[PDB]
Design a protein around this ligand. Structure first.
Ligand SMILES: CC(=O)N[C@H]1[C@H](O[C@H]2[C@@H](O)[C@@H](CO)O[C@@H](O[C@H]3[C@H](O)[C@@H](O)[C@H](O)O[C@@H]3CO)[C@@H]2O)O[C@H](CO)[C@@H](O)[C@@H]1O[C@@H]1O[C@H](CO)[C@H](O)[C@H](O)[C@H]1O
Ligand SMILES: [Cl-]
Length: 138
């Protein structure tokens, strides 16, 4: 088991064909999960499943630049379940991050941060038991 929050270095940043795989289990009564792809203090891609926002479940995605959050992108398709094992795959493509959960396509997030090779950390945080976090080039 990994300790959360967990930092995964992404050496030399991200690049198309880089596949990041996160395995874990959502805690019972979870409130949130966050994946934060970081460029220094900025968050190039924030992926934030929320389990109770006004008693609804929603994934919020955004970018943090100079400590300001941008315009949120919201997805109501919500494949996570409290208590249950999940797999998140983030595949870097030329124009977006492409996210699949449990082998099903979920969403894409267009690159707002252009310096992919400076997005050199992934923070994994929130209400999970984290089993593994890794990357490979496909
Ligand atoms: C309060 C909180 O949860 N802080 C988190 C931070 O959460 C923000 C993001 O999810 C953004 C993405 O757009 O939304 C913010 O809420 C919006 C909300 O969606 C809007 O409807 C509303 O109108 O505005 C608010 C705020 O603009 C969330 O507050 O996400 C970051 C990245 O994961 C977290 O780091 C932060 O938690 C803090 O992290 C610190 C270390 O990084 C410390 O752990 C600190 O104690 C945490 O509170
Ligand atoms: Cl940039």
């Amino acid at each position: 088991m990994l300790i959360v929050p967990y930092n995964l270095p992404l050496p030399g940043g991200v690049v198309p064909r880089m596949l990041i795989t996160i395995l874990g289990t959502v805690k019972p009564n979870a409130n949130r999960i966050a994946l934060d792809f970081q460029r220094g203090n900025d968050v190039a891609f924030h992926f934030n499943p929320r389990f109770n926002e006004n008693n609804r479940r929603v994934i919020v995605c955004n970018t943090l630049l100079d400590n300001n959050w941008g315009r949120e992108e919201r997805q109501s398709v919500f494949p996570f379940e409290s208590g249950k094992p999940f797999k998140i795959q983030v595949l870097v493509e030329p124009d977006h991050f492409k996210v699949a959960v449990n082998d099903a396509h979920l969403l894409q997030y267009n690159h707002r941060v252009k310096k992919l090779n400076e997005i050199s950390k992934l923070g994994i945080s929130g209400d999970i038991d984290l089993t593994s976090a890794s990357y490979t080039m496909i």
